Write a protein that binds this ligand. Structure first.
Ligand SMILES: Nc1ncnc2c1ncn2[C@@H]1O[C@H](COP(=O)(O)OP(=O)(O)OP(=O)(O)O)[C@@H](O)[C@H]1O
Ligand SMILES: Nc1ncnc2c1ncn2[C@@H]1O[C@H](COP(=O)(O)OP(=O)(O)OP(=O)(O)O)[C@@H](O)[C@H]1O
Ligand SMILES: [K+]
Ligand SMILES: [Mg+2]
Ligand SMILES: [Mg+2]
Ligand SMILES: [Zn+2]
Lengths: 639, 176, 195, 196, 624
């Protein structure tokens, strides 16, 4: 009572700060941008009133009610009409919560009625449904209107109000609902699961249930990595006047954050200068910098850079489509770093979905039906390739996938669409992704005296659907062995600067993020003797963060093909296709088709993107032709 | 200082024994120890009392304050108050340990006495813990600890003093 | 630059219980050679700065001078910490060191130890009228005049009084005055039996 | 009877013969070079003006002067406002072992560079120590004959010294009460030499 | 009143036990064991103690008898006494510690256990001691200890209603207590539970399977449900062998027959064990143990001591016992700055002749490893080894269940009869053996699991016994799988007069010695200690190669590659055993394992020399 009034007074004092002005300005912006939720940083509250912050974090529901009442009063003070516009104003929290930073494993009963910040992966989402807040009813006979308020266990002030609408007045005269005058709010439920890398040994990850209401709905979709700030509550229930004493617990969100680069003017200037510095060296340097811990497979790295940059998809006025996504296949001998390159792309690309041939199915790749959590409605859940829409799917052990499962990949690889015709569902799903696949030859170890087609053991149509195919061979050469051995041993000797000698990597880890914003760019990575060697360092390495920003900026450019590039590409395609037995030893790894011409155009466009050029010039076309020439032919040894 | 040295200091306290031998007055450097006569009481330092008991030459008598009623009143008073209360001996814990370990056959109700002394010790240790926490949390420069015995201080003195030294250096960083 | 001296320091830091490792002769020689190289380069730079009036070399001279000072500091700290451990040896074991421990010490360290031992003996002799007071004994408060001791290893004749000695053989037990057994107990030759 | 030279990193100057201080000053510190530095380009041939380098604290302290002739010093991220705010929320959950073993000693020596944020660095170091005292005192004085690896995991070097002192006090009293403090024993060094 | 007086007297007796109990003698000293433990735990913020039943019996035999016969009431009284004693030991308390906390009292005894099969009806509501194996654990859920209820109509509230422990519910008041006059009557069932007024504790549910040796012949093992709460929650995981003290109890659900209850038999009830104490069986490190482990690691011949301790019953196989020791300790897992991982686990394959103790070696490593799973290749499937997708009975949704390599994460999986495994099942293990993850994309689940385990496999050759004439036809495995093994041993049962006589005498003496009472062996480490020593080293030490050791390894690797390349050219057949970069990293792992045995931060040239000798005897011998 008196404590609630004092808390409301304190919160009103906190938001009226013109006498530094951060929250007075924030509320003005809230009004201007047509919002009804203000995000408050608990660090400022802690600075100005420590006791009020501790109470807010430890007695969450009452303190949040007082905070929201104070916010409504303040907004009304700035502008009364706007305050009348909205039923309620909400408060979200951010900053550092100390020990309240938890995961779904560490979120225990001791955090009940507290504000917590949870970090995890979204596994399940639900449909948005309306929830009645205030009901308005009219009496035609008596010409008067009556209002009703509803609340449940999920509201800030929990009370189990009745769901039945009024139907008649105290007088027998009947009542009719004014739906356009009533108030409803959106409601959704999600599940957040522990990050698998953080789980203890042998343990499947734990999960927690979260409730999103109002604006927070649809802020997260399955597959996202999120940070949710909310309040922890138990939902007690009874049946037949009996309670089991065991209660479900939910997190009632007040803020949802994602874990889209943010660009400062200095970074933009750095990117522009980097693009301007060299004409031909940008692409080569970027490709050299891709996966530093792997000794060079230089052409493969250039191809992977092209895949990350991509081409430009064409939409024609008639409605026909030409894809811009570049697909790559790597077939190789054991232990040539195929899986490591796939893992690097998984770690670096903005949207990358891992998959194994033996551990995946067509259903799991495309989409699955099941009963809706509510009403038991036949609903669809996205598979790997739909989750990878406008992203990358990395398929390891591609040769192990079943033929029937493999066939489901053709339509996505070529057209970019998934057709679902099952369980009384007819849908066309967008799966516009780039496929990066790794495989072994039929005999495990490539037989140089057999032909590429006999070693690869795949149908010509599937091979045709791949923009580039790379045969990676392990040839015992003493000089190459020396270089690779030096690189590998240097990698294994490395010790990160923070760690001490003798330290062992733990299996699992506690929560390390202690704030919503990370308390912690340079173009070139700082030289390390072990990571780079004692060589004179003539070749410089671009840093990971700068590479991530630069590739993001370049992916948005759409280079336009020019007449000279088109002429060169056409002539080179004619030469590639006409040439039969161009070298008598030489054999074609994949057939040359009009898809090869489209691949040339795609690679040239990606190269032009790397330079941040608005036009595709002859140098880009030459690079694409060089890549295709390297990839499409292999010498066959004669015994 | 370690605990053995605090016990060494405690061993200089006077207790009463009944010997079973005859001896003339001894002129020790510390001071005279009166004649010893079988069956009659005499006052000696605690170290000599323990030694003579271990050699089967004397029977020890409990100190006046080693009484269950008095000790119960003292424990209740210690629990009621906020500061440290004055103790019956400046080495009550050491005297209790030595006497009850070596002469329980001579001291009736030794178990109750040990339990009451343990209660008092626990209460006083908790009060000292509160004092240290208050000293650090409120950033004091000085404190008063009256009626606190040497053994109680020595139990955690080094830790507290080292922490205070570090805290003082952190408080005086900005002075050039 | 000063990474060899850092190795010198790290070796000692890794053993915070006072044990004496083998003297790091090669590390010390490396540090001294580096110091000489730095000094020669600085001398050339200083001569050029005087001759041609090039100011731009002064920061380099300062950098090299700081590196030299750092090397000196690490060397001296290493040597001094070793001296502290050697000093502890005298009070923990006695005036005559086991050969195992002697092996780790350098010859100059042995000379330092002998000088310190002589000085301590002189001081202890000067305290009293005759023989002074040997303050290396009586390390703990005394409880009983006599104690029971068990021989942990074969040691041979051990003099109780000038007239009489007793043979120390493993697993024999003796009831003896404490002041005659303290030193052998501290050396791990006897064990104090409490019953 | 072996007592290493003690640390003086919290004072105005560190101790010349302190191994801990030498290790602490070995740690790096970002700097910006305010003058061309000839004949040292090999180690980082001249180093151009305005270059950004990481130098050991001892080397930065040697070259630094109040007028910023040779170089200017920037604070590590750990001592900047972003992390100072994290410390204020709850100093008991931050891992000071990973964020610099000599967290207090290093931060104390940063005050020599006359940064505009000196008062804030100083106040943060004090509050962090005060806010962590109770847990250090309780764990050190109540973890008896137990595994302490999880109790000292997040403590820095200075705090680990206090923890060892607290454990020593707890152990000594327990030995005295159990009657083990009266036996004459082989010296500590002898035990670690002849039985280890 | 009389019942209150009896309860108060019993609580007083428990309090006096806690205040007065002592351990020691008048020759040495005395310690108030339980009072001191309570004081230290409360100061640490851990609000629990563990009480020995033998100590309580020594203080007061009747109290122990009551606690055994009627555990619930007397345990509640003991907890109240513990709370009282905790206040007195810590009573002047610092700010923010005003409110006295509840104390959970755990129970421990020295009595012999009893089996699940022996749990009969006459033991209902009694204290029982049961051994078993944890096979399943639920998620941590919230169980109310105290509730507040409010009236829908009048808002009249009843506060601080105590809840029964265990799997027991509560019946709400039927009618409200408000005044009948003036107000319209309150409705039936007017009370609802106030969410924010409820005090909750963490709870868990477990399945305890009977010990494999206790199962009657020809029967499927039985299991029992366990209820854990507060600090007993999340202590054990599936695979742990435990002995539990608890209350044999019955689920108390609603009295009403809601949903028209229609049981196959009448008056039947569901049993469970309310857990009061857990003891993990060998089959945190104390400072004494840690000192002993440091002593072992410093022995100049520690490598020989550990090797002699591995399957001491097997007569020979010294090189294979040395390689198994390296596998048990493992290498150093690393993560490079770019995010790519290098595995530290070691894989070993024994391919050889029948009756050469290959299966006996695998059985030993299952017992010796801190985490160990034994499976058969014939009895395995692709989903069984890695992970499965299946329907949840309660939820009506797809879930995931881990296989052998999820259960063995952080340890070793022993795959016997590796040759009998189907090719489609064998191929499912490639990702887990190198990337140490399991990728699943099925039935709407897209996730990745950890499978950081070492593979120890045994198999026979193609023709049963290794035939030297058949050459490369003896091996059937693909190059892809074989390159994932750090060491490959070709075991050939060599017939020699001298060795055969020695082996026969060893085997006979082993069978006669089965009657002898067990005795220690001076030069070996018992399995229990070796198991703990391995776990200690793996957490404490991750070594690295020294710069000098790396140069030695680089030069020998180049020679090895040239020799393998030359051998294939001369024979005109590509060899079955490949020598790749994986084999270079294998030698690094074996060198690091040898250092980890000695708790050394850096692997030396001698470590690399021994690692290269092991590689020579195992894989190069096979490849040539
Ligand atoms: N060129 C290389 N540079 C660096 N590391 C390499 C190189 N080749 C192999 N490695 C390392 O050797 C191991 C090769 O395993 P990896 O899974 O990458 O091989 P792979 O080509 O995918 O084999 P497979 O077809 O058998 O799955 C990894 O540790 C990888 O880091
Ligand atoms: N060297 C040995 N020392 C002692 N016992 C041995 C030895 N070799 C075999 N045995 C015993 O002989 C039997 C061999 O059976 P086991 O299952 O261990 O053989 P295996 O080599 O795995 O054979 P298989 O390939 O036929 O499965 C077991 O009793 C084992 O204890
Ligand atoms: K049913
Ligand atoms: Mg692979
Ligand atoms: Mg077998
Ligand atoms: Zn009512």
């Amino acid at each position: 009572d008196v404590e609630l009034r004092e808390a409301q007074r304190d919160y009103l004092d906190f938001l009226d700060d013109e006498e530094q002005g951060i929250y007075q300005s924030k509320v003005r912006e809230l009004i201007s941008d047509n919002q009804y939720r203000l995000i408050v940083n608990v660090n400022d509250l802690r600075r100005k009133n420590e006791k009020r912050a501790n109470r807010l974090l430890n007695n969450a529901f009452e303190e949040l009610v007082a905070f929201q009442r104070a916010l409504k009063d303040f907004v009304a003070s700035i502008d009364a009409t706007y305050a009348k516009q909205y039923e309620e104003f909400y408060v979200g929290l951010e900053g550092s919560f100390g020990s309240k930073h938890v995961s779904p494993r560490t979120l225990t009963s001791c955090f009940l009625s507290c504000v917590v910040c949870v970090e995890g992966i979204v596994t399940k989402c639900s449909l948005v449904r309306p929830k009645v807040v205030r009901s308005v009813h009219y009496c035609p006979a008596t010409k008067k209107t009556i209002e009703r308020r509803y609340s449940d266990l999920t509201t800030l002030v929990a009370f189990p109000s009745s769901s039945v609408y009024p139907t008649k007045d105290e007088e027998n005269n009947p009542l009719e609902t004014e739906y356009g005058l009533s108030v409803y709010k959106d409601h959704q439920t999600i599940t957040i699961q522990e990050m698998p890398e953080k789980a203890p040994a042998g343990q499947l990850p734990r999960s927690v249930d979260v409730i999103l209401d109002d604006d927070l709905v649809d802020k997260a979709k399955p597959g996202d990595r999120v940070q949710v700030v909310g309040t922890y509550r138990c939902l007690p229930g009874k049946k037949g006047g009996y309670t089991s004493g065991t209660f479900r617990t939910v997190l009632i969100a007040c803020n949802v954050k994602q874990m889209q680069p943010s660009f400062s003017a200095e970074d933009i200037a750095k990117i522009k200068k980097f693009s301007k510095t060299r004409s031909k060296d940008i692409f080569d340097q970027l490709a050299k910098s891709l996966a530093p811990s792997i000794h060079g497979h230089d052409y493969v790295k250039k191809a992977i850079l092209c895949l990350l940059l991509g081409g430009v998809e064409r939409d024609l006025e008639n409605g026909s489509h030409i894809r811009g996504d570049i697909n790559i296949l790597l077939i190789g001998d054991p232990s040539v770093a195929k899986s490591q390159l796939l893992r690097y792309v998984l770690c670096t690309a903005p949207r990358a979905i891992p998959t194994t041939g033996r551990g995946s199915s067509g259903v799991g790749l495309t989409a699955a039906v099941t009963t809706d959590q509510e009403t038991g409605e036949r609903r669809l859940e996205a598979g790997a390739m739909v989750l990878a829409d406008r992203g990358v799917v990395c398929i390891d052990e591609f040769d192990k996938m079943s033929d029937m499962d493999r066939t489901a990949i053709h339509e996505v690889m070529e057209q970019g669409r998934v057709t679902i015709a099952k369980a009384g569902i007819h849908a066309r799903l967008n799966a516009r992704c780039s496929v990066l696949a790794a495989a072994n030859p039929v005999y495990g170890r490539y037989d140089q005296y057999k032909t590429p087609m006999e070693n690869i053991g795949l149908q010509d149509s599937l091979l045709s659907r791949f923009d580039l195919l790379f045969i990676m061979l392990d040839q015992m050469d003493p000089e190459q062995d020396r270089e690779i051995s030096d690189h590998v041993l240097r990698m294994h000797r490395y010790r990160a600067p923070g760690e001490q000698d003798g330290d062992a990597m733990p299996l699992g880890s506690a929560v390390d993020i202690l704030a919503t914003d990370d308390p912690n760019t340079q173009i070139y990575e700082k030289h390390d003797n072990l990571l780079h060697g004692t060589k004179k360092k003539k070749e410089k390495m671009v840093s990971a963060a700068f590479m991530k920003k630069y590739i993001h900026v370049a992916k948005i450019i759409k280079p336009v093909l020019t007449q000279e590039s088109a002429t060169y590409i056409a002539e080179e395609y004619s030469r590639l296709r006409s040439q039969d037995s161009m070298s008598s030893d030489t054999a074609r790894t994949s057939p040359v088709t009009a898809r090869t011409l489209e691949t040339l155009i795609r690679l040239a466009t990606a190269h032009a993107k790397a330079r941040m050029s608005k036009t595709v010039d002859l140098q880009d076309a030459e690079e694409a032709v060089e890549l295709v020439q390297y990839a499409y032919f292999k010498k066959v040894l004669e015994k | 200082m370690d605990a053995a040295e605090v016990e060494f200091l405690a061993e200089k306290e006077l207790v009463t024994i009944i010997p079973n031998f005859s001896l003339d007055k001894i002129y020790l450097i510390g001071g005279d120890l009166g004649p010893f006569n079988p069956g009659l009481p005499v006052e000696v330092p605690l170290w000599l009392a323990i030694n003579l008991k271990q050699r089967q030459k004397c029977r020890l008598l409990p100190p006046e304050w080693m009484d269950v009623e008095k000790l119960e009143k003292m424990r209740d008073h210690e629990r009621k108050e906020e500061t440290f209360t004055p103790m019956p001996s400046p080495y009550y814990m050491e005297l209790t340990k030595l006497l009850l370990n070596h002469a329980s056959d001579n001291i009736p109700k030794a178990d109750e006495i040990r339990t009451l002394v343990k209660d008092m010790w626990d209460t006083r240790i908790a009060k000292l813990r509160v004092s240290a926490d208050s000293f650090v949390r409120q950033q004091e420069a000085h404190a008063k600890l009256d009626n606190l015995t040497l053994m109680e201080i020595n139990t955690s003195g080094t830790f507290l003093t080292q922490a205070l030294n570090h805290m003082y250096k952190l408080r005086t960083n900005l002075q050039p | 630059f000063c990474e060899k001296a850092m190795e010198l320091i790290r070796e000692l830091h890794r053993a915070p219980e006072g044990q004496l490792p083998a003297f790091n002769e090669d590390g010390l020689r490396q540090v001294l050679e580096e110091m000489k190289a730095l000094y020669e380069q600085n001398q050339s730079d200083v001569n050029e700065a005087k001759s041609g009036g090039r100011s731009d070399l002064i920061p380099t001279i300062k950098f090299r001078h700081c590196s030299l000072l750092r090397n000196r500091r690490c060397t001296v700290a290493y040597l001094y910490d070793r001296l502290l451990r050697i000093r502890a040896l005298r009070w923990e074991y006695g005036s005559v060191l086991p050969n195992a421990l002697r092996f780790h010490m350098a010859a100059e360290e042995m000379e330092w130890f002998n000088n310190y031992k002589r000085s301590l003996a002189t001081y202890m002799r000067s305290l009293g009228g005759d023989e002074g007071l040997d303050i290396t004994q009586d390390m703990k408060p005394p409880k009983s005049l006599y104690i029971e001791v068990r021989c942990l290893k074969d040691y041979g004749e051990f003099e109780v009084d000038d007239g009489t000695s007793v043979l120390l053989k493993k697993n024999s037990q003796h009831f003896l005055p404490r002041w005659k057994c303290e030193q052998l107990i501290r050396q791990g030759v006897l064990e104090h039996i409490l019953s | 009877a072996y007592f290493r030279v003690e640390s003086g990193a919290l004072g105005p100057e560190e101790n010349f013969l302190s191994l801990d201080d030498i290790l602490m000053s070995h740690e790096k510190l970002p700097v910006r070079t305010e003058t061309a530095m000839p004949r040292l380009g090999a180690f980082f041939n001249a180093v151009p003006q305005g270059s950004k380098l990481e130098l050991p604290l001892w080397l930065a302290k040697g070259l630094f002067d109040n007028k910023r002739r040779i170089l200017s010093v920037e604070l590590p991220k750990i001592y900047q406002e972003g992390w100072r705010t994290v410390f204020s929320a709850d100093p008991n959950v931050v891992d000071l072992h990973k964020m610099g073993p000599h967290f207090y000693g290093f931060g104390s020596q940063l005050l020599h560079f006359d940064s505009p944020e000196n008062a804030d660095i100083s106040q943060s170091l004090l509050q962090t120590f005060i806010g962590r005292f109770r847990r250090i005192m309780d764990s050190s004085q109540n973890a008896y004959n137990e595994d302490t690896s999880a109790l000292v995991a997040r403590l820095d070097e200075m705090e680990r010294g206090l923890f060892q002192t607290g454990q020593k006090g707890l152990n000594d009293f327990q030995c005295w009460e159990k009657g083990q403090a009266s036996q004459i024993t082989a010296s500590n060094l002898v035990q670690n030499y002849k039985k280890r | 009143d009389e019942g209150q007086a009896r309860k108060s007297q019993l609580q007083r007796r428990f309090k006096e036990f806690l205040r007065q109990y002592r351990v020691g003698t008048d020759r040495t000293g005395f310690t108030f064991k339980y009072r001191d433990e309570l004081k230290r735990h409360y100061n640490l913020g851990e609000y629990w103690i563990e009480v020995e039943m033998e100590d309580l019996a020594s203080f007061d035999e009747d109290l122990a008898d009551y606690l055994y016969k009627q555990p619930a009431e007397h345990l509640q009284l003991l907890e109240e006494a513990a709370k009282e004693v905790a206040d007195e030991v810590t009573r002047p308390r610092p700010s923010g510690e005003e409110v006295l906390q509840d104390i959970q009292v755990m129970l421990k005894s020295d009595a012999s256990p009893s089996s699940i099969r022996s749990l009969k009806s006459d033991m209902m509501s009694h204290l029982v001691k049961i051994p078993g194996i944890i096979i399943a654990a639920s998620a941590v859920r919230a169980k109310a200890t105290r509730i507040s209820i409010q009236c829908r109509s009048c808002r009249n509230t009843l506060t601080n209603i105590a809840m029964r422990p265990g799997l027991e519910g509560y019946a709400l008041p039927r009618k409200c207590n408000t005044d009948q006059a003036g107000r319209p009557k309150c409705p039936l069932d007017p009370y609802f539970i106030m969410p924010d007024k409820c005090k909750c504790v963490d709870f868990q549910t477990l399945k305890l399977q009977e010990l494999p040796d206790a199962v009657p012949h020809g029967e499927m093992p039985r299991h029992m449900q366990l209820y854990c709460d507060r600090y007993l929650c999340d202590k054990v995981v599936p695979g742990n062998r435990v002995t539990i003290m608890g209350i044999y109890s019955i689920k108390k659900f609603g009295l009403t027959t809601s949903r028209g209850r229609d049981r196959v038999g009448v008056g039947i009830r569901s049993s469970y064990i309310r857990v009061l104490g857990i003891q993990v069986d060998t089959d945190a490190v104390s400072p004494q143990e840690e000192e002993e482990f440091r002593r072992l690691a410093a022995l100049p011949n520690v490598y020989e001591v550990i090797s002699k301790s591995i399957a001491p019953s097997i007569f020979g196989g010294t090189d294979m016992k040395k390689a198994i020791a390296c596998l048990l300790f493992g290498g150093s897992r690393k993560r490079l700055p770019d995010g790519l991982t290098r595995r530290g686990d070691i894989n070993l394959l024994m391919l050889g002749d029948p009756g050469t103790a290959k299966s006996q070696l695998l059985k030993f490593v299952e017992k010796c490893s801190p985490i160990g799973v034994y499976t058969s290749g014939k009895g395995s499937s692709a989903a069984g080894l890695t992970a499965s997708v299946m329907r949840d009975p309660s939820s009506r949704n797809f879930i995931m269940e881990g296989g052998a390599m999820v259960l063995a994460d952080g340890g070793v999986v022993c795959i016997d009869e590796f040759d009998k495994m189907r090719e489609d099942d064998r191929v499912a293990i490639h990702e887990a053996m190198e990337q140490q993850t399991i990728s699943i994309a099925k039935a709407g689940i897209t996730t990745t699991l950890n499978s950081r385990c070492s593979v120890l496999a045994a198999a026979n050759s193609v023709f049963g016994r290794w035939d030297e004439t058949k050459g490369e036809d003896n091996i059937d495995f693909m190059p892809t799988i074989l390159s994932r093994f750090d060491m490959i041993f070709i075991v050939k049962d060599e017939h020699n007069e001298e060795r055969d006589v020695m082996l026969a005498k060893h085997v006979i003496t082993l069978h006669v010695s089965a009657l002898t009472q067990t005795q220690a062996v001076e030069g070996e480490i018992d399995l229990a200690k070796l198991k703990k020593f391995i776990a200690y080293c793996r957490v404490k030490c991750g070594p690295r190669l020294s710069a000098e050791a790396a140069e030695k390894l680089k030069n020998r690797y180049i020679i090895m590659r040239s020799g393998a390349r030359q051998h294939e050219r001369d024979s005109d057949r590509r060899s079955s055993i490949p020598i790749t970069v994986r084999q270079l990293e294998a030698i690094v792992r074996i060198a690091e394992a040898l250092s980890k045995m000695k708790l050394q931060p850096f692997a030396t040239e001698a470590d690399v020399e021994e690692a290269l000798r092991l590689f020579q005897v195992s894989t190069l011998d096979a490849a040539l």
